[PDB]
Structures are given as C-alpha cells and as structure tokens.
Write a protein that binds this ligand. Structure first.
Ligand code: 9PE
Ligand code: 9PE
Ligand code: Y01
Ligand code: Y01
Ligand code: T14
Ligand code: T14
Ligand code: UND
Ligand code: UND
Ligand code: UND
Ligand code: NA
Ligand code: NA
Lengths: 857, 284, 49, 49
C-alpha cells in the first residue's frame, strides 16, 4: 500500500500460517508483543501524560523488538501510535506496528503499490485507514485479532527467555464496549496479562476495583454511556468486569501518582512477571524469573523476590546471568550479583574478556581509539591499544573489565567495577587519563563531551579517595602515590595525574605536601629557611643540633633538593663572579689557569644539560628559555675556538663572544630569580606573559625590518647588513608624504602598542588555585628529578653511571564508599519514602477499621 | 525606544526564544551531528530567506552561536574537507610538500588535492605564506632592483597587487558599506591606492618624480607589513583575547587622535611664539 | 527536527518535577486518604445509634 | 544478602567492638556474614582504629 503492506481477510482465515506469513516471507520474530485497545474513538484526549506513556511504549517496543497490534485506523490513539512509530523510525533508536482492521468499515478500496486516499474525516461513519502502520490486516475485527494473540501466546520459541511463550501484554486505556470486551478475551481465552491506566472510562472502572458497586463506579467514569445501551447489556457489562477480577494477577495499573519515567517499563515487566510467577510451573524456577527481571530493569523485584534466603541459589551458577548483566548495560544488576556473592576475579577468565572486546566492544569506540592512538598518542594509550588488540586477536583481570567499561563511556557500570579493583585511586586516575585522551578525538562531540565529564568524575573519585587515604595515614598514602602498579600502564598515581593534567588531584593538600616533603628531602620542614642557608656556608652547623633531619646527616643534608638548588644558585653566582674576574683582569693572551677553571665549569654545565637531553622526547626544546642555555654554552665553545687562533682580529673577537655570553649567563640567573620568587600564584601570570612579550618582540622585529626597507629604500649582501642592524642603531624630501607618514606612525603605534597591552593583560582571560598548584607541582618535580647532587660533583655521579598498601587502600575505599551514601541522606531528606510511610500507618487504621463494620452490620 | 515596557519585554521574549533555540539544537546536535548541521544551513523556503546560522548572527544571538554544536560546525567549515585531529604542523608540511597529500598523511574523511587546497585552513596558510613571499619580493625589488624602468620582477609586483586589488573590490561586493567601518580594512585600499599612485609617479621620467615614486613605494612597504602584523596579531589572539583586542585597538585610535589634537595645539603655541606655509609648519 | 522537538518538549516537563516536588498535589492526597477513613466512618455511627 | 545497609551495621559493630575492646563470638566458617565479619576484622586491624 502507498499513502506498508496489506492482506485482505475474512474472519475465518487459516491455521496459524498467518504468523508464518509474517516471519518467512516477511520480518523477524518477537521477544515481546504489545497489543493496544482503544476502539474507533475519533476523540482522544491526547494529554502530555498520555503522550509520554505511548511514546515510552513504542520506545520499549524497539528496545525489545516487539510487534504492536492496534486497530489500523486514523483516529486518535491509533493515529498517534502510528505517528510515534514513524517518529521512532526517523529518530532511529526496527518497530512493527501491525494494524488490524475490519475490511468492511474502511472508506475506499483498491485491489491488486496500491494508492490510498486520505481525503477528509467527515460525518460518514465509515473509518479511514491509518497511514503510518507498517503492516495492515483487513466490530468485525475482534476475532482474527484475538485468535492471533491466542496463537502467538502459545507459540513456543526455541530461544525461550520467558518460558518460551512469546511475551504478550494487553495495553488498555479509555472506554467503550469494544475495549471492555477485548480485555475479557485477553484474560479468559488463554491467559496473557493486561495493563490498564489511570485515565479513561473503562480504564478507570477497572482501576477503581483494585455487586452493583461495580455499576456505582461505572457511572462515575462513564455516565453518558449507560443512557444508551440496554439493561440487558448493562447486566453484561457488570458481568464482564466480573471475569477480569477473577484473575487479579493479570492486571497492572499505571496510577497517576507515578509522575515520572520508568512507569511503562515498570508496568509491562510487572505484568509479565506475575504471568510468569502465578503460572506456578515456574515458582520453583528462580533462574527464569531472574533473566526475565534482568532483561527488564526491575532491580527491586529481583532483590525482594529472588534473593530472599528462602530460595537457595549458591552464587556459582550466576556466571552467564552476570555476563548478560554486563553486555546489556545493567549496572544495578552487576552490583546486585556481587552483593549476593560473586567472585568477580573468578568469573573474569581471559576468554570472557576476549568475548567482551570482540563481540561486545562497539565499533564506533574502537574507531575512536585509532583516532586517539595515532593522533594524540601517550604511554598509556600505547598500552591500552595493545591490550585491546591482544583480546581481539584471540594479568589484572579486574582492570581489563574496567578499561572496557570506561572506553565505552558506560558511566554507572564502570563505577561498579571500580569498587572491585585493587589499586583504585590509580584506576581512577588511569581512567581519567584514558578518557581525556578519547575526549581529544573530535570525530564526535557528543562522545568526546561525555568522556570529558567521565574523566572529571574519575578525577574527583581519585581526589576524594586519596583525601580519605591521606587523612588516615600520611606515610601510607605517600607509598600509595609512588606505587609502580605492576604495569597498570607502568605508572604511578603521581605520573598518571600529571600526564592527564589532572589539576584537582595535584592541587590537593596531600599531594602538595608530598612534593614539599620531596623538595626538602630528608631535611624536615618547620626548621626555617635561613636555618638551612646558614648551614650551607657553615659545615659543622649540620652536625650541631640545628636542623631537624627526621656521616649520614651530612649526606641527607647535601642531597635534599632545597640544598642542591641553593648550592647551584650560590655556585652559579660564584661562577659569574669568576667569569667577570677572568674577562676583565685576566684574559691576557693564553688560557690562564683561572680561565681553564671556567672551561670545565661550563663543561659540567654542558654535561648536566646533555643529561637533560635524556628524559628528553624533544620536550626540552619547547621550553623557550632552556634552549637559551645550550645556545649560551654553544656560544661559549664557539668563543673558545676563537681564542685559540693567535690572530688579534680573532682573539679580540673571541673576547667579544665571551662578553656577549656573559649576559645570557646572567639572563639565566635573572630567569632563575624571577621564577623562584614568583613560585606561587604569579607563575600563571608569569610564563604566559613571557610568551606574550615574545610575540610582541617578534612583531616589533617584523616592523623594525620593514622600517629598514623604508629607510634604506629612501636613501642610496650589503643589504642584510644594513636593513637589519641600522634600524636598531638608529633607535640606539617632504613632497606631501607626511600626510601619510605620521599616519604610518599612528598605525605603527596602535598595532605594536596594542600587542604590548595584550601582553600585559592576556594572562587574565582564559579554578586558579588548582591551575597554579598543578604548575608549582610541575616545575618543582623536574628539579627533584634533576639529579639532586651538588654541581661541581655532578660529574662524579655522571661518569659513575657510565602489596599491603593495596590492602590498606581497599579498606580506605570501603570507608569512602560509605561516606558517599551516608551523605546521600539529603537526597533521602525528601518525601520519597516519607510520604506513604504514614499512609501505611493509616492503612493500619484502615486495617483495624476492617474489624469494626465486620460485626455492626 | 518609544516604550521601555514594551521593549523591555520583547527583549526578554527574545532571550527566551534564543534559549529555546539553544536547547532544541543541543537536543538536535546530541542525536545526529550530520543532520543538525543540515538543519543549520536550511534555506527555509523564505522564512525570511535565511538560515538558522545567518539569523543568529544578525540578531547577535551569542548563546546560540557559543554552543558546542555551532562552534564545531565552524571548525568543520574552517578545516574544510580536511578532517580535524590530524595536527597543525601535519597540514603545514603538506603545503611545502605536494606529494605528502597523496601519501597516507592527512585524513580527508585528484579529488584529495582539490579538497586539500580548497579548505579555508590551507587557503589562509597559503595566503599568509604568499604574502610574506610578496613582501620579500617587494623588499628585493625596492633595494636591489628598481633602476629606472619597470623591471620584469617589478611587473610581477604590479600584478600581485592587482590580484590584491581584484580580491578586495570583490570584497566591495558583499559590501553594504560594512567594509568601510572595519578600521584596518580601509588601510588595505589606501595601501593599494597608494601603490597605484606610486606607479604613475614611476612612469614620469623626471628624477624628482622618479625618486618621489620610490618614496611612495617605501612608505607603502610599511602598511603592507602593518597588514601582516595585523594578520599575526588577530590570528594569535583568536581566542578569549579577541575581545580585549579590537576594543583596545579602537581605544588607542582615540588616544592617538587626542594626541594628534594636542600635537596640533602644541604647534600653534610653538609657531606663534617664534616668527599656506603654516600648514607645512604647524603639523609636521 | 519535529521528532527532536517532541523529545525536547518532554524533557522540559519531566524536569518540572522539582516544581511538582512541592506539597501542592501532595497535601490533600493523604487527606483524601483520611476522608476515605471518614467515608468508612460513615458506616460506623450509621448503626450504633 | 550483603546490602550496603548490612555493610554499615556490621562495620559499625566491629568498630564498636574495638572502641570498647570486645570479643565477637561467631561461627568460624567462610560463608556470608561470618565470612564478612572476619573481613571487617582484618579491615579493622589494617586500618588500625
Ligand atoms: C652578577 C650576580 C650578582 C648576584 C647578586 C646576589 C643576589 C642576592 C640573592 C637574591 C636571590 C633572589 C631572591 C629571590 C627570592 O625572592 O626568593 C626568596 C628568598 O628571598 C630572600 O632570601 C630574602 C633576602 C635575600 C638576601 C640575599 C643575600 C624565597 O623566599 P620565600 O620562599 O619565602 O618566597 C615565597 C614564594 N616563593
Ligand atoms: C617581512 C616579513 C617577515 C616574515 C617573518 C616570518 C614569521 C614567522 C611565522 C609566524 C606567524 C605568526 C604566528 C602567529 C601564531 O601564533 O599562530 C599560531 C601558530 O604559531 C606557530 O606556528 C608556532 C611556531 C611558528 C614557526 C614559524 C616558522 C597558531 O597556533 P594555535 O592555533 O595553536 O593558537 C591557538 C589560538 N589561536
Ligand atoms: C652574595 C651571594 C654570594 C650570597 C647570597 C646568597 C643567595 C644568592 C642565595 C642563598 C639563599 C638562596 C635562596 C634560599 C631560599 C629561596 C626561596 C626558595 O623557595 C622555594 O623553595 C620555592 C617554594 C616551592 O618550591 O614550593 C627557593 C630558593 C631561594 C629562591 C634561594 C635563591 C638564592 C639565595 C638567595
Ligand atoms: C619563513 C616563512 C616563509 C615560512 C614560515 C611559515 C609561516 C609564515 C606560516 C606557515 C604556518 C602558518 C600558520 C599555520 C597555523 C596558524 C594557527 C591557525 O589557527 C587557527 O586556525 C585559528 C583558530 C580558529 O580559527 O578557530 C591560524 C593560521 C596560523 C596563524 C598560520 C600563520 C603563518 C604561518 C606560521
Ligand atoms: F629556578 C627556578 F626556575 F625558579 C626553579 C625553582 C624551583 C625548582 C626548580 C627551578 C629551576 C628550573 C630550571 C628550568 F626550569 F629552567 F629548567 C632551572 N634551570 C637551571 C639551570 N642550572 O644550570 C643551567 C644554567 C646555566 C646554563 C646551563 C643550564 C640551567 N636551574 C633551574 C632551576
Ligand atoms: F588573519 C586573521 F585576521 F587573523 C584571520 C584569522 C582567521 C580567519 C581570517 C582572518 C583574516 C581576516 C582578515 C580581515 F578581517 F582583516 F579582513 C584578513 N584580511 C586579509 C588580507 N589578505 O589580502 C589583504 C592584505 C593586503 C592588502 C589587500 C587585502 C587583506 N587576510 C585576512 C585574514
Ligand atoms: C628566606 C630566608 C632568606 C635568608 C637568607 C640568609 C642569608 C645568609 C647569608 C649567610 C652568609
Ligand atoms: C610617533 C609617536 C606617536 C605617539 C607615541 C605615544 C605612545 C606612548 C606609548 C607609551 C607606552
Ligand atoms: C602550530 C604548528 C606550527 C608548526 C609550523 C611548522 C612549520 C613547517 C615549516 C616547513 C618548512
Ligand atoms: Na613606533
Ligand atoms: Na610602542
């Protein structure tokens, strides 16, 4: 059909190959089958509540793969049911909406792509077919429908998730004789369950009953119906409601009090559970009721009615029930199976994990791994992309599952498996490092936008766990920082927080105190600053009772990074005073013995820095001031070979290279003074302003070159020696050209002035205690890594080179996990549980008012 | 401003409908990016004859434009058919090296070469590289060449500013006299008009005019470099400093105006204390 | 875009449950439950007198 | 059924038992509560309260 399939049928059709028509020449079979009953009511109060209930129903029908049996006409609900079906195929979350019509009640007919005319819906009582139903089969209709549902309820499937039985549910709302008749043929012919609602005429007369008091409530909800149909038909209606309350287990109500989601999936699953439970051929079966309550998300029904200690499972049979709890993303059920006993390390064999990374790893996330591994590479990503490829080509098993959940952005499933890991403040940072690598991938903003926040949730979990760890024992938490992880990724928690730029983990007072312990070395804090400095100039004051080291005292003093840095600054000044004494009073013609001292004092400055050409990765060359140090030392060695040339034009030029080298050796000392003073909140203002003036001095040099072309082009390989140098030395005819020449200077200034003022203020635009404390931790960490031995005795170390904490961290996790849930009492402060806790207390008053009218009548 | 109460409630109803367009497009972008970006450039069958993207930038709808769906669409537009996540230097090294495009080196998501050289990231990086090579040729001609006649290297410079001229009278379309209130884009015409005025002073055969033709070219070298400095200072401060820039840049144009007004009044006090000549002495 | 509007319009109203968190509907939902107790206390003094 | 509520009640109990210096008489087998009761005891000796 074209406004879709069509089949003409009379009522006495065939023997069940109508279903085999639907599955052999046609679409797939069913794990679920909802039917809808509203009749040909042209009026339908389409409330936004009714819009949610019948949009969740189509969403559930594609979440399970169901058919929907409706009258296939273009009126009200069954028109709206079709529109949510085409809304679902457009949104692409398929769903099959099979329409059941009379063939005698339709408007037009075309017999053979057939064309149908949706002309207009006037006063003619014939019905208009609906345009959005995927299949159409054509109160004539209510036997071929009811015999089909009485077939497929008995159709035994070999898959058999719901005792075989192809789960049927009858979704009912609204009034009319036809919807009250169809609930009867639902319950009484065979027994599929029925769901009713809290709005409608016939829907509320059965919702009120969960006698002639039937008819009392019946004229409450539909009084203008009784005035037309007969009293020999009013007697049948009270009779009809009597055969639906004979089976009160096959009825679930959607009460108006449920003002939220879950409510359509709660009602269908509860109705499917009773029709599984009250069958009683299944009450001994705890396992079929588990997979039924796990395919749906009924956590509370599984906790109350399957794990009771009246049923006796023994938790070793719970293996395949756990695997489907993982791959369907049921985070409440993987938590329920560990709470009721499951050794998750025993369950996670290596072929289960390769069953998870092959079949259950999504190809979109695996596509974003290649855009992460090849474009934004790290030491962790090369480990994890290797670890994914080992499983896909077919030992810490709890972290292979944890990486699997974290990669797929499974937000609540990964937090269940994180509480089972052993190194769990390291798995939280290892997830935060991994997710921040996936958040760099700009192939999808929605995937990267949720891996970015899942990284911030796991950074906050590592903060709150380590704050719990540091508050209990400092010396144990600092062993937990530097734990070498047995190849988690081959990193500490401290390394893995600084690659990820995890500023909240690094700015916390436990980590910042660990670095101050590292920088002071074996010298304690609280001594004083000047108390350590005066022990530098005075050796026997160390052995005196003067510092607090918490001989072996002298080696602990002179290997602390505070002392080594203070020595390397004091020796650098004494190097500069010797470099100034040689350059002025000495330096006659030959390399004097005091200058030979300077030749080895820069060689130990050179070997210290090609040592920093290890731990290198060409990170060192993007530091913008550390490249000055090589080019100060390379300019020194170039000034040595000009000294050993015996020409007075070259010897003097060898001195000039040394005198210009004295400034960059002092500019390094000025740079050391300006960073060590502004270590503190100004280190963000510094080094961002310092790259901002390098851009302004670059643009000033570009303008100074262009000023040279305008200068030399106005006047008369010589050009490079005159277009570059003389504009700086000049800062050391009028045709009418001053009409633009001051407008040159009014445009030269206001592009160099603005670039200067951007440099002063550009640090402000674009948390600033955490932004600082990461960088203060960053800079101090490299010097504590920079060979904490005195500088002239660095060569004597350079050429001489040529799990009970995890048990302790596990008990700190349990104290941390309690402190989350006991703080979620302001969430339980609300009237959620508090509302009908006392309506239970007046139902007890109702339960004792049962006793009163029992004997007064 | 005929009624503040009517205009004060149409202002908030505009902010309610801008927020409705934000939350709907954030719903649209979170479901399918490729469908939401077709929804941006939908030509509306004459709603007003506009996209959602045009209609948000005329209205200065900053909340619709600052959302991550629209900002990602522009970064898709600026990178062109070249994907993101390649690297910055990975695209630059394919400018100097043509066969590195055909190699497995960028990620374009021959037809690869036309998709490379029509992306706005590459065209802008080419137009900066060619602008520097224009300035080095303009410096080589102005110093070593430029003897008396228009040398063949200088004829190259005469057409390289003509393609700079025709590119910009092309920007005298899409124009509305919007282009003339940009305060630095009017420098570019007056750099090119000052160039063409420096051409007709070269073809005059007088040594007082030929030398003055060179002076006009040498003063024109700075505004061609001040444009390059302006290109560098905007492309670096693309980021949160672009509000600090271009508001500070009009603030120094006011200060240099008031400095020039004081420098004129200092000239009257200077020349009035000492002994058509006045305009050549009170200003310069 | 029309089906993305319907998903957006639901997310407005399902987020207006903190507005429905108040005791507006919650106040006499249980006073209805004690009026049912009043409605069955209709039955008691009907026959003691 | 080791609920998180049951986890709090039998972790406070071991915490009370060291806050007072008590003995805890349990069946000494490796099943459920008496397995968990042992684990909070070794959790308490590790945490050293
Ligand atoms: C040619 C070479 C000429 C050499 C001139 C000698 C320079 C004198 C020493 C000054 C070192 C630079 C100071 C940087 C700084 O402020 O760090 C200061 C130390 O300042 C002082 O020592 C105060 C008096 C110094 C007396 C020196 C004899 C670090 O102090 P503090 O840790 O409290 O700073 C908090 C945030 N970092
Ligand atoms: C007479 C003419 C003389 C010509 C001198 C040559 C100028 C050298 C090129 C510099 C271009 C201006 C830089 C502006 C900028 O910062 O954009 C930078 C590119 O900077 C670099 O390329 C770094 C090294 C450049 C090495 C050049 C060989 C854009 O980088 P990014 O996108 O990450 O910035 C974030 C916010 N926009
Ligand atoms: C006349 C000359 C030869 C003798 C003067 C001695 C100073 C040049 C020396 C001795 C004390 C030194 C200072 C000792 C303590 C300070 C603060 C100190 O602060 C920190 O540790 C940074 C805080 C942090 O890392 O978290 C860093 C070294 C510094 C700048 C040192 C810089 C150079 C100083 C001033
Ligand atoms: C010695 C000369 C002849 C060769 C030096 C080459 C540079 C002059 C060229 C090649 C790389 C170019 C850059 C390539 C990438 C950057 C950053 C790029 O950043 C953006 O795309 C802005 C962000 C945004 O629009 O959202 C803008 C172009 C820019 C400044 C280009 C400016 C000029 C550059 C430095
Ligand atoms: F001081 C400082 F920045 F506040 C600082 C403060 C706190 C901790 C460490 C440092 C620091 C940082 C660096 C840098 F980050 F820059 F690498 C340093 N570099 C040197 C040099 N000593 O010899 C050299 C100088 C002479 C030429 C050869 C190399 C380098 N000392 C440093 C101390
Ligand atoms: F670079 C820039 F601003 F950071 C920028 C960054 C990002 C995107 C675009 C631009 C940009 C903006 C403009 C402006 F907004 F100013 F129009 C540009 N104008 C030019 C010129 N090329 O030739 C001309 C120079 C020589 C004289 C004739 C005209 C103009 N390039 C631009 C690039
Ligand atoms: C921040 C304390 C700085 C004290 C410097 C003391 C200098 C001692 C010099 C001894 C010769
Ligand atoms: C050609 C001179 C134009 C006026 C220069 C004033 C600039 C003052 C800058 C102070 C930072
Ligand atoms: C922001 C990345 C800038 C990289 C510039 C690379 C320059 C390549 C020059 C090749 C001759
Ligand atoms: Na200037
Ligand atoms: Na200036």
């Amino acid at each position: 059909i074209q406004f879709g399939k069509y089949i003409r049928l009379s009522c006495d059709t065939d023997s069940e190959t109508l279903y085999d028509l639907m599955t052999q020449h046609w679409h797939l079979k069913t794990p679920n089958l909802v039917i809808s009953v509203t009749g040909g009511a042209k009026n339908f109060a389409l409330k936004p509540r009714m819009r949610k209930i019948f949009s969740r129903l189509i969403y559930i029908a594609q979440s399970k793969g169901a058919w929907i049996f409706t009258g296939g006409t273009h009126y009200g609900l069954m028109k709206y049911i079709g529109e949510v079906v085409r809304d679902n195929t457009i949104s692409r979350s398929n769903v099959v909406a099979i329409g059941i019509a009379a063939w005698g009640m339709i408007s037009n007919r075309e017999t053979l792509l057939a064309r149908y005319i949706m002309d207009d819906l006037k006063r003619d009582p014939l019905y208009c077919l609906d345009n959005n139903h995927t299949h159409l089969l054509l109160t004539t209709e209510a036997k071929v429908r009811t015999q089909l549902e009485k077939y497929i309820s008995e159709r035994v499937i070999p898959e058999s998730n719901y005792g075989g039985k192809i789960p049927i549910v009858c979704f009912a709302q609204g009034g009319g004789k036809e919807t009250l008749k169809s609930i009867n043929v639902a319950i009484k012919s065979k027994i599929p369950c029925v769901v009713v609602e809290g709005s409608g005429r016939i829907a509320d007369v059965i919702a009120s009953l969960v006698s002639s008091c039937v008819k009392e409530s019946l004229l409450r909800f539909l009084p203008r119906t009784i005035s037309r149909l007969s009293e020999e038909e009013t007697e049948s209606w009270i009779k009809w409601i009597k055969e639906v309350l004979e089976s009160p287990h096959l009825l679930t109500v959607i009460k108006i009090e449920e003002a939220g989601d879950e409510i359509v999936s709660n009602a269908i699953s509860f109705a499917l559970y009773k029709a599984f439970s009250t069958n009683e051929h299944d009450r001994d079966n705890w396992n079929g009721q588990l997979k039924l309550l796990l395919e749906w998300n009924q956590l509370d029904l599984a906790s109350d009615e399957i794990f009771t200690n009246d049923r006796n499972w023994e938790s070793a049979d719970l293996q395949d029930v756990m695997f489907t709890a993982l791959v369907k993303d049921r985070p409440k059920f993987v938590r329920l199976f560990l709470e009721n006993g499951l050794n998750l390390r025993k369950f996670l064999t290596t072929e289960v994990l390769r069953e998870l990374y092959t079949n259950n790893f999504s190809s979109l996330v695996f596509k974003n791994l290649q855009i992460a591994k090849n474009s934004y590479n790290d030491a962790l990503l090369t480990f994890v992309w290797k670890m994914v490829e080992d499983f896909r080509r077919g030992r810490h098993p709890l972290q292979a599952l944890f990486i699997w959940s974290v990669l797929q952005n499974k937000k609540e499933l990964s937090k269940v498996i994180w509480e089972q890991t052993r190194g769990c403040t390291l798995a939280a940072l290892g997830a935060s490092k991994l997710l921040k690598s996936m958040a760099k991938v700009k192939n999808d903003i929605n995937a990267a936008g949720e891996s970015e926040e899942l990284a911030n949730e796991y950074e906050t979990r590592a903060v709150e766990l380590f704050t719990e760890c540091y508050s209990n024992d400092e010396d144990l938490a600092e062993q937990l920082l530097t734990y070498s992880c047995e190849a988690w990724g081959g990193s500490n928690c401290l390394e893995l927080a600084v690659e990820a730029r995890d500023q909240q983990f690094i700015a916390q007072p436990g980590v910042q105190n660990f670095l101050s312990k590292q920088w002071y070395g074996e010298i304690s804090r609280d001594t004083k600053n000047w108390k350590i400095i005066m022990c530098l100039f005075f050796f026997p004051l160390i052995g005196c009772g003067f510092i607090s080291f918490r001989f072996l005292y002298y080696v602990s003093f002179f290997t602390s990074p505070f002392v080594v840095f203070s020595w390397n600054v004091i020796f650098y000044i004494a190097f500069l005073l010797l470099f100034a004494y040689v350059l002025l009073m000495d330096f006659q013609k030959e390399p004097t013995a005091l200058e030979i001292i300077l030749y080895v004092l820069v060689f130990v400055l050179l070997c210290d820095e090609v040592r920093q050409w290890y731990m290198n990765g060409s990170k060192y060359f993007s530091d913008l001031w550390n490249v000055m140090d090589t080019l100060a030392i390379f300019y020194f060695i170039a000034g040595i070979v000009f000294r050993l040339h015996s020409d007075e034009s070259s010897w003097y030029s060898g001195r000039v290279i040394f005198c210009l080298d004295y400034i960059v050796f002092t500019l390094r000392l000025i740079h050391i003074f300006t960073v060590s003073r502004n270590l503190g909140p100004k280190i963000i203002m510094l080094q961002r302003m310092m790259i901002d003036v390098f851009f302004f001095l670059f643009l000033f040099a570009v303008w100074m070159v262009a000023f040279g072309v305008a200068r030399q082009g106005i006047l008369r390989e010589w050009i490079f020696r005159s277009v570059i140098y003389e504009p700086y030395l000049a800062m050391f005819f009028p045709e009418w050209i001053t009409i633009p020449l001051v407008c040159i200077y009014m445009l030269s200034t206001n592009i160099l002035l603005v670039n200067l003022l951007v440099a002063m203020f550009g640090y402000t635009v674009g948390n600033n205690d955490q932004v600082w404390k990461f960088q203060r931790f960053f800079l101090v960490q490299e010097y504590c890594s920079r060979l904490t031995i005195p500088f002239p005795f660095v060569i004597f170390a350079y050429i001489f080179m040529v799990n009970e904490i995890l048990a302790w961290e596990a008990v700190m996790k349990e104290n941390y996990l309690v402190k989350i849930n006991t703080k979620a009492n302001d969430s339980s402060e609300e009237m959620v549980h508090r509302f009908r806790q006392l309506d239970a207390k007046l139902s007890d008053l109702k339960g004792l008012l049962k006793e009163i009218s029992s004997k007064i009548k």
